């Protein structure tokens, strides 16, 4: 599919030091639907693909001015408040495990050893999987349902919209021929528009002159009607063609998997006439729930934070008490 | 004016690892009156000046024991909780855009490749300009009144007191 | 009032006794204001002031 598509330059609000630029690593969209905390990041460049369209995991292709160029995969980095762990890369997509942050930065080092980066405001603080806030993933534990972006390079379910790009504006193409406009193509296909009469519009392959016209009244751009590009809101739509679009499958789709797991415990107490007394000693917030085993259950619940004595009425029908992850306790009067 | 003035060694409470020293990059004063968040930092060394008093933006002069010595401008760094963006340097002054922090560090690398730094406790959390807490500066938007330290190398209004040193 | 962020609500009577009042509206809040004969001026955040008069 990469024979038809290409990396591109798009708007980035922060290319370093808070200044905006036409970035070759522009951030398109950050996806965080995976409960395991994995981020699916979309950028303007293409990883694992060379300029000749061949697949090479050690390489990366980015738009260098007018033509795409090759760069090293090792130079690619993802960071929030600190560096991220990159779990997978293919085309416009990056999979990363990031620490807590308020921004997201994706960058690389080009052929000329020049670093390029794009920073977007993104609140990253992934929710806890289960009931324990841990750092490293265990080999053994409680199996809990979670979602992730699969590390499989295969593109079969998820998709993106693609269309023909865009023309690269270049004011150096135009020059003041005494008191007229001289458009020099230099062996390229140039799209030009002048705020003058006559042949003020055209897709030229040869040099053109616009008499009685000023250089400021004209617009010139180098084109390439040959090449699909992601339907980016950071790049303008092709003016000639209407709502013409294609679609391509993307790597790393979101899928339901299993995430390690954990457990819990329980306690005991003291008795009275149609009454149960429990001395709760929680080591962390523990949910206490209870119900009558008759016609009127009267379900009640409370999160127990610390040392609390609970006095519960045990009716003739019986009382069922659930203390955290423990199996429910059942009580009946004598 | 740099023909009459010189870089110097002065007390710094933290030259690295919490130990005090006679620093060639000692922090004098940190100014934060600019509502745009720009910090005007004053140090004991002189940036953009060589030992022969000539102006060179790629160079820096610091007091090396008894005599001043030349160092690279590229080796100069400013950091709070993370590295700062240096916006301007001239003589004893540095302009920097810093992230939120509780300390301020200014350092450099000397001729002998030895790093020198000075850390002072400084609460940096600049207030919001307007009614929106944003990260990067926009090209277009609402024009609001704010103050900054102008990046102009020219010295015409603000001043400092000077006198003969020391043994 | 449906604010997306803290929004300053201010109001005054357009007569001899303006009785200026202000409050920072954090979330969903219904505000009941008295409109006197002289008129009432209401400013909701950065919007231009709204003016109300009885029929």
């Amino acid at each position: 599919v990469y024979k038809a598509t290409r990396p591109y330059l798009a708007h980035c609000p922060d290319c370093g030091e808070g200044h905006s630029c036409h970035s070759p690593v522009a951030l398109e969209r950050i996806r965080n639907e995976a409960t395991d905390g994995t981020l699916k990041i979309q950028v303007s460049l293409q990883i694992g693909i060379k300029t000749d369209d061949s697949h090479d995991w050690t390489k990366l292709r980015y738009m260098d001015n007018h033509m795409p160029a090759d760069a090293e995969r090792a130079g690619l980095f993802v960071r929030t408040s600190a560096p991220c762990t990159i779990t997978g890369t293919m085309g416009h997509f990056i999979l990363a495990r990031c620490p807590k942050g308020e921004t997201l930065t994706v960058g690389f080092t080009d052929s000329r050893k020049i670093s390029h980066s794009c920073t977007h405001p993104f609140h990253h603080d992934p929710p806890v999987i289960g009931r324990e806030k841990f750092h490293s993933r265990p080999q053994h534990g409680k199996e809990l349902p979670c979602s992730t972006y699969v590390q499989s390079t295969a593109a079969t379910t998820e998709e993106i919209e693609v269309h023909m790009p865009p023309d690269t504006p270049d004011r150096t193409l135009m020059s003041q021929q005494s008191g007229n406009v001289k458009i020099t193509v230099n062996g390229q296909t140039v799209r030009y528009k002048c705020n003058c009469g006559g042949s003020n519009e055209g897709l030229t392959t040869t040099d053109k002159v616009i008499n009685n016209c000023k250089v400021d009244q004209c617009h010139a751009a180098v084109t390439n009607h040959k090449k699909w590009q992601y339907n980016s809101p950071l790049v303008p739509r092709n003016a000639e063609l209407g709502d013409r679009k294609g679609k391509i499958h993307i790597p790393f789709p979101l899928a339901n998997v299993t995430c390690r797991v954990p457990k819990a415990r329980n306690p005991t107490v003291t008795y009275g006439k149609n009454q149960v007394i429990m001395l709760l000693y929680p080591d962390h917030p523990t949910l206490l729930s209870y119900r009558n085993m008759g016609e009127e259950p009267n379900y009640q619940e409370e999160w127990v934070m610390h040392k609390k004595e609970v006095v519960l009425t045990v009716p003739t029908e019986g009382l069922e008490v659930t203390w955290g992850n423990n199996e429910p306790y059942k009580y009946w009067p004598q | 004016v740099y023909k009459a003035t010189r870089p110097y060694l002065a007390h710094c409470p933290d030259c690295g690892e919490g130990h005090s020293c006679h620093s060639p990059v000692a922090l004098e004063r940190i100014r934060n009156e600019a509502t745009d968040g720009t910090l005007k930092i004053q140090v004991s060394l002189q940036i953009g000046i060589k030992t022969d008093d000539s102006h060179d933006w790629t160079k820096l002069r610091y007091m090396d024991n008894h005599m001043p010595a030349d160092a690279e401008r590229a080796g100069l760094f400013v950091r709070t909780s993370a590295p700062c963006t240096i916006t301007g340097t001239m003589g004893h002054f540095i302009l920097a855009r810093c992230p939120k922090g509780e300390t301020l560090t200014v350092g450099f690398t000397d001729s002998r490749k030895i790093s020198h730094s000075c850390t002072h406790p400084f609460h940096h959390d600049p207030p919001v300009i307007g009614r929106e807490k944003f990260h990067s500066r926009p090209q277009h938007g609402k024009e609001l009144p704010c103050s900054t330290y102008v990046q102009s190398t020219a010295a015409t209004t603000e001043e400092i007191e000077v006198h003969m040193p020391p043994d | 009032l449906y604010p997306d962020h803290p929004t300053l609500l201010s109001y005054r009577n357009m007569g001899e006794e303006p009785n200026y009042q202000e409050e920072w509206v954090m979330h969903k809040k219904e505000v009941v204001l008295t409109v006197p004969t002289e008129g009432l001026e209401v400013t909701w955040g950065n919007n231009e002031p709204y003016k109300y008069w009885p029929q």
Binding site: - | D167 | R12, M14, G15, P18, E22, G39, E41, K51
Partner: protein
């Protein structure tokens, strides 16, 4: 002919006034508050801004005792520390082991920001009232700017205007005011030499050029660290920086009667409070005699559309029989109904269309076109809603 009327002191509301000179065709004048300025006389007490702590090199007297002298400087602090033995890079600064003293010296001054970022404390007294406004006079809009004291006569197109005196002498300004850029605040500011630490006036400068300043910020000099040359000290944050966040809403937002507040000079514009008498000495040439004006008969009125609201929600079609061609004044003879049109051109046996405003659901009103009255019956429907957003 002197026409005298009274309009409420409310800006942006066009008012219609009927001028009836005996033996002359009625004249309708539309008046809309131009501007009414209340500029108080200001006397600068002092300016305040962010403060800056001047600490020179400490006087380390080797083998001797330094002496502190009383210096007339704001928050002047001096302390002589005995038993000091300071070190420099190449060893001890003093020849003596004992009997060395360090004189620590400090004072407080205006920051470099004081020329750009500052608040001015003024004594405001006896405001001078000034006026102008918009008058639809002879099919053209004329602007009259006059002091609302009932004395300042302003003549525009031979028509002499006397505005005021204002029914309310209310200001929105108190005896003591504070000005910061384009914002004015009513504040009983501390007098010069009475400023509190961490509060408005912690630093006080009589003028922004003043060399000497008053300062009350808790500057205390501390004993330097063993073998260390430095001036340690303990010191309340900027009162001006504190006031900038604690000032609250300015007079432009809090003032009654819909007052607009401007600076350079400090003034109250278009006060929302009381009423304003208007005197217009209309020249003889502006009037047309009843005989020289068209005579209207066989008048009928129909209201095809009406909505009772703050704006002109009513439409009225008036059929007439005019004796000759000419301009006729249009006016509502009922105070509960107001007409948008002040003057219309008549031809003969033709019809006219007018726009009217009313709050009445059942509006029965009389329309005077030239010197003849016509009854209009209107069934007006509710708008959007009650309360209205126009004056």
């Amino acid at each position: 002919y002197e026409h005298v009327t009274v309009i409420p002191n409310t800006v942006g509301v066009p008012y219609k006034t009927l001028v009836n000179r005996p033996g002359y065709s009625p004249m309708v004048l539309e008046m809309e508050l131009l501007s009414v300025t209340l500029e108080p006389t200001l006397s600068l007490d002092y300016i305040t801004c962010e403060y800056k702590t001047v600490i020179p090199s400490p006087y380390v007297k080797c083998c001797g005792t330094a002496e502190c002298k009383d210096k007339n400087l704001p928050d002047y602090s001096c302390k002589v520390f005995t038993g000091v033995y300071p070190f420099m890079w190449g060893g001890a600064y003093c020849f003596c082991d004992a009997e060395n003293t360090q004189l620590s010296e400090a004072h407080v001054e205006k920051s470099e920001s004081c020329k750009t970022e500052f608040a001015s404390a003024y004594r405001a007294h006896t405001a001078s009232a000034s006026a102008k406004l918009r008058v639809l006079y002879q099919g053209n809009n004329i602007t009259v700017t006059a002091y609302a004291n009932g004395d300042h006569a302003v003549t525009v197109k031979d028509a002499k205007f006397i505005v005021g005196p204002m029914s309310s002498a209310w200001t929105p300004f108190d005896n003591k005011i504070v000005v910061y850029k384009g914002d004015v605040y009513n504040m009983d500011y501390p007098p010069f030499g009475a400023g509190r630490p961490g509060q408005f006036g912690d630093i006080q400068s009589r003028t922004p050029e003043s060399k000497d300043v008053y300062a009350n910020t808790q500057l205390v000099l501390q004993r330097p660290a063993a073998g260390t040359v430095h001036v340690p000290y303990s010191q309340a944050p900027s009162g001006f920086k504190y006031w900038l966040k604690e000032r609250g809403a300015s007079l432009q937002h809090t003032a009654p009667f819909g007052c607009q507040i401007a600076t350079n000079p400090v003034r109250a514009v278009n006060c929302a409070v009381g009423n304003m008498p208007i005197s217009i000495d209309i020249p003889e040439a502006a009037f047309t005699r009843v005989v020289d004006a068209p005579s209207l008969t066989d008048m009928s009125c129909e209201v095809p559309a009406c909505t009772h609201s703050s704006d002109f929600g009513g439409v009225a079609i008036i059929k007439y029989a005019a004796s000759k061609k000419g301009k006729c004044a249009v006016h509502s003879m009922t105070n509960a109904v107001t007409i948008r049109e002040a003057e219309i051109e008549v031809e003969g046996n033709s019809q006219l269309q007018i726009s009217f405003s009313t709050a009445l659901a059942s509006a029965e009103f009389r329309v005077q076109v030239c010197s003849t009255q016509v009854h209009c019956a209107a069934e007006c429907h509710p708008p959007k809603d009650h309360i209205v957003n126009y004056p």
